[PDB]
Design a binder for this molecule. Structure first.
Ligand SMILES: CCCC[C@H](CN(O)C=O)C(=O)N[C@H](C(=O)N(C)C)C(C)(C)C
Ligand code: NI
Length: 164
């Protein structure tokens, strides 16, 4: 199923997710719906928070042909380094994009869709995305890195869209 994606300024977006207690069928369905939703929404990543599910779950596909599925359950940032930034966009902040500072490289530990633990070292688009998603899990948005002026503006643009 395709789930509804919240938009700012829904305060549900500022909630802090809990850790998945056990990777089971219920969890795997959530994972499956999140992939469907992400591809439907044309995003390269999605955090459970965005669909009103407050558990540490993230799905990713940064692939060019959109055929590389990546699931991060209960992810942990192990090491990080460098600084970088692109013009990021968010499914929760429709049509707004901005450069935000990010580590250039990251190393994380997580559980896969089968609840199997794995380690991954990433860089380029993949690392920034991973960072974007993990921030969601702690109720943080990209616009938070910006100026109040810029923040107000983004907010206004979003409310007008959602109005139409
Ligand atoms: C850095 C990863 C950005 C993740 C978001 C989705 N979302 O909000 C997840 O929480 C996304 O797919 N943005 C696109 C994007 O910014 N790219 C640079 C591909 C679009 C704005 C194109 C959808
Ligand atoms: Ni986002």
């Amino acid at each position: 199923s395709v789930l509804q994606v919240l938009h700012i300024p829904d305060e549900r977006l500022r909630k802090v997710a809990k850790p998945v207690e056990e990777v089971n069928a219920e969890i795997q369905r959530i994972v499956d719906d999140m992939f469907e939703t992400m591809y439907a929404e044309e995003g390269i990543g999605l955090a459970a928070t965005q669909v009103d599910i407050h558990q540490r779950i993230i799905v990713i596909d940064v692939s060019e042909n959109r055929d590389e599925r990546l699931v991060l359950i209960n992810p942990e940032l192990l090491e990080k380094s460098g600084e970088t930034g692109i013009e990021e966009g968010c499914l929760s902040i429709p049509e707004q994009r901005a450069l935000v500072p990010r580590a250039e490289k990251v190393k994380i530990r997580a559980l896969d869709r089968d609840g199997k633990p794995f380690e991954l070292e990433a860089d380029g688009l993949l690392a920034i995305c991973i960072q974007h998603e993990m921030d969601h899990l702690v109720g943080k948005l990209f616009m938070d890195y910006l100026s109040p002026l810029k923040q107000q503006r983004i907010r206004q643009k979003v409310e007008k869209l959602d109005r139409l």
